Design an enzyme around this catalytic site. Structure first.
Site, PDB file in Angstrom:
ATOM      1  N   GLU B  15       0.811  -1.219   0.000  1.00 50.64           N
ATOM      2  CA  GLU B  15       0.000   0.000   0.000  1.00 50.64           C
ATOM      3  C   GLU B  15       0.838   1.259   0.000  1.00 50.64           C
ATOM      4  O   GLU B  15       0.354   2.294  -0.447  1.00 50.64           O
ATOM      5  CB  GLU B  15      -1.012  -0.002   1.155  1.00 50.64           C
ATOM      6  CG  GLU B  15      -2.092  -1.078   0.933  1.00 50.64           C
ATOM      7  CD  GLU B  15      -2.930  -1.393   2.147  1.00 50.64           C
ATOM      8  OE1 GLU B  15      -2.412  -1.347   3.284  1.00 50.64           O
ATOM      9  OE2 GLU B  15      -4.125  -1.736   1.962  1.00 50.64           O
ATOM     10  N   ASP B 200     -11.773  -6.313  -3.439  1.00 51.67           N
ATOM     11  CA  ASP B 200     -12.531  -7.550  -3.402  1.00 51.67           C
ATOM     12  C   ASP B 200     -13.927  -7.256  -2.853  1.00 51.67           C
ATOM     13  O   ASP B 200     -14.203  -6.145  -2.409  1.00 51.67           O
ATOM     14  CB  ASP B 200     -11.819  -8.596  -2.532  1.00 51.67           C
ATOM     15  CG  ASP B 200     -11.644  -8.134  -1.086  1.00 51.67           C
ATOM     16  OD1 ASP B 200     -12.576  -8.333  -0.292  1.00 51.67           O
ATOM     17  OD2 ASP B 200     -10.560  -7.579  -0.772  1.00 51.67           O
TER      18      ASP B 200
HETATM   19  C1  LIG Z   1      -0.040 -10.499   3.375  1.00 50.92           C
HETATM   20  C2  LIG Z   1      -1.142 -11.144   3.408  1.00 50.92           C
HETATM   21  C3  LIG Z   1      -2.389 -11.896   3.544  1.00 50.92           C
HETATM   22  C4  LIG Z   1      -3.239 -11.290   4.660  1.00 50.92           C
HETATM   23  C5  LIG Z   1      -3.845  -9.987   4.168  1.00 50.92           C
HETATM   24  S1  LIG Z   1      -5.114  -9.450   5.262  1.00 50.92           S
HETATM   25  C6  LIG Z   1      -5.914  -8.176   4.308  1.00 50.92           C
HETATM   26  C7  LIG Z   1      -5.215  -6.811   4.366  1.00 50.92           C
HETATM   27  C8  LIG Z   1      -5.871  -5.853   3.363  1.00 50.92           C
HETATM   28  N1  LIG Z   1      -6.634  -4.888   4.200  1.00 50.92           N
HETATM   29  C9  LIG Z   1      -7.930  -4.488   3.629  1.00 50.92           C
HETATM   30  C10 LIG Z   1      -8.929  -5.518   3.134  1.00 50.92           C
HETATM   31  C11 LIG Z   1      -9.230  -5.805   1.806  1.00 50.92           C
HETATM   32  N2  LIG Z   1     -10.211  -6.761   1.698  1.00 50.92           N
HETATM   33  C12 LIG Z   1     -10.607  -7.103   2.934  1.00 50.92           C
HETATM   34  C13 LIG Z   1     -11.586  -8.021   3.515  1.00 50.92           C
HETATM   35  N3  LIG Z   1     -12.342  -8.739   2.675  1.00 50.92           N
HETATM   36  N4  LIG Z   1     -11.668  -8.123   4.868  1.00 50.92           N
HETATM   37  C14 LIG Z   1     -10.910  -7.365   5.697  1.00 50.92           C
HETATM   38  N5  LIG Z   1      -9.987  -6.498   5.241  1.00 50.92           N
HETATM   39  C15 LIG Z   1      -9.837  -6.361   3.897  1.00 50.92           C
HETATM   40  C16 LIG Z   1      -6.716  -5.440   5.577  1.00 50.92           C
HETATM   41  C17 LIG Z   1      -5.370  -6.095   5.697  1.00 50.92           C
HETATM   42  O1  LIG Z   1      -4.346  -5.095   5.890  1.00 50.92           O
END
Ligand SMILES: C#CCCCSC[C@H]1CN(Cc2c[nH]c3c(N)ncnc23)C[C@@H]1O
Ligand SMILES: C#CCCCSC[C@H]1CN(Cc2c[nH]c3c(N)ncnc23)C[C@@H]1O
Lengths: 232, 232
Positions: B15, B200
């Site tokens: 990011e 997403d």
């Molecule tokens: C590296 C890696 C894998 C784990 C990633 S967790 C998702 C990240 C993206 N961010 C936002 C997000 C995008 N889609 C989401 C979702 N579906 N639920 C919660 N958070 C998010 C929260 C966190 O920083």
């Protein structure tokens, strides 16, 4: 070789009331970031006492403020917790050897529960401080248990959630701040000890038990924390 | 009348990569509390850029460090989020008007979900910064939505949890840091703006969508954040 600066934290006002009373010294109240820090001198040590307010975000903020704004060299946490195991009864004391954020869930990416990338499931506390706690407890003939504490942003009050915490994390007690306090201390390289006294059994009757025993359990933890500070 | 100090935050390295690239200035890397802060000069402003690491505790810590250690006067958050509403499509931009910690549960004491004593369910962001965002979006002919963002320590990937966030909080998007960043800023009286681009749909396919669109969505958010900094 300045004066030692010790941070002393609870989550709730009720957890620090007995701490302030027991130290019995004059405190200057200093407001910062929505908290009030109580700064005093006790023996050759500067003590900075505060309650964070409830939960992980509150406690993370306050611990970070203690370290960056007040320059504390150690952090001792005192408060109450829900018991997850038959041998931890109301009023019993436990020192956390490791802590986990039990509500973290990145299982969509096949990570184990509790795990975040660039971190770990279990956060360690200070071995030297935990050894001090055990030494004092043995000399005072106080039962002090040690084990894993689970922390999350929910008050646990169900058999089902208790059993999950035991099965998943081998946790002995549950609360809403220990893991975040210990985490911040680990990130800054500051020794941390987390002490909790049992207020309830984290079951359907936990809210009522908590209301009944908060004062007594908070005092039990505070008295033990003071005995540790006396040896620092 | 010193130089304005602006904090710029993401959760993940991905990011902030486009943020560092787009500003195009030399940054000094400064380690503190497990984070790396990138300090640079852009027009008459000092910009301090960092990724917190994922989730509420990480983001609370990093925001507190930005404020106390680096003296930032405003905090702008840029990153990606899951959409909870049909009209927010992949790549769309949203500015958070209020945020909530959707996983907080003190219902054992008859508190509404999201609520902690001495706090509130909804945390406000800066009206002046949100007005600036809307003004720029209108001039650039960019669709910018506004609404409630829900933050918790779980990656949301189910119809059932999406529907809860909409029903309980009237949330438009979900992520794991906005509420904690905004909360810390509120506690210190620091203006905060939270920008997110959709990666997403927070459903059963969210993990795969997120992996596919993280780069593009992070860039979309970063480009908009830069356009805001250009007007500060
Ligand atoms: C590296 C890696 C894998 C784990 C990633 S967790 C998702 C990240 C993206 N961010 C936002 C997000 C995008 N889609 C989401 C979702 N579906 N639920 C919660 N958070 C998010 C929260 C966190 O920083
Ligand atoms: C004020 C008020 C009502 C809300 C109190 S939430 C419970 C506080 C006590 N503390 C520890 C605790 C004791 N029993 C618990 C339990 N059963 N679940 C989670 N935490 C706890 C966490 C939080 O600071």
């Amino acid at each position: 070789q300045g004066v030692q600066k010790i941070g002393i934290l609870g989550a709730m006002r009720e957890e620090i009331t007995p701490i302030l009373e027991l130290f019995g010294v004059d405190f200057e109240e200093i407001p910062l970031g929505g908290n009030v820090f109580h700064k005093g001198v006790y023996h050759n040590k500067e003590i900075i006492v505060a309650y964070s307010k409830i939960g992980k975000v509150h406690s993370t903020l306050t611990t970070t403020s203690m370290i960056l704004a007040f320059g504390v060299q150690k952090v001792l946490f005192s408060g109450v917790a829900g018991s997850l195991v038959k041998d931890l009864k109301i009023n019993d004391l436990l020192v956390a050897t490791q802590l986990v954020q039990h509500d973290v869930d990145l299982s969509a990416f096949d990570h184990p529960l509790g795990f975040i990338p660039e971190s770990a499931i279990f956060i360690e506390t200070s071995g030297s401080l935990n050894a001090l706690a055990k030494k004092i407890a043995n000399e005072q003939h106080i039962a002090l248990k040690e084990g894993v504490i689970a922390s999350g942003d929910q008050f646990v009050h169900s058999k089902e959630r208790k059993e999950f915490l035991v099965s998943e994390f081998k946790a002995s007690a549950v609360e809403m701040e220990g893991a975040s306090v210990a985490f911040v201390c680990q990130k800054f390289g500051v020794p941390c000890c987390v002490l909790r006294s049992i207020s309830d059994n984290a079951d359907e009757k936990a809210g009522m038990s908590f209301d009944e025993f908060l004062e007594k359990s908070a005092h039990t933890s505070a008295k033990f924390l003071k005995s540790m500070v006396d040896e620092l």
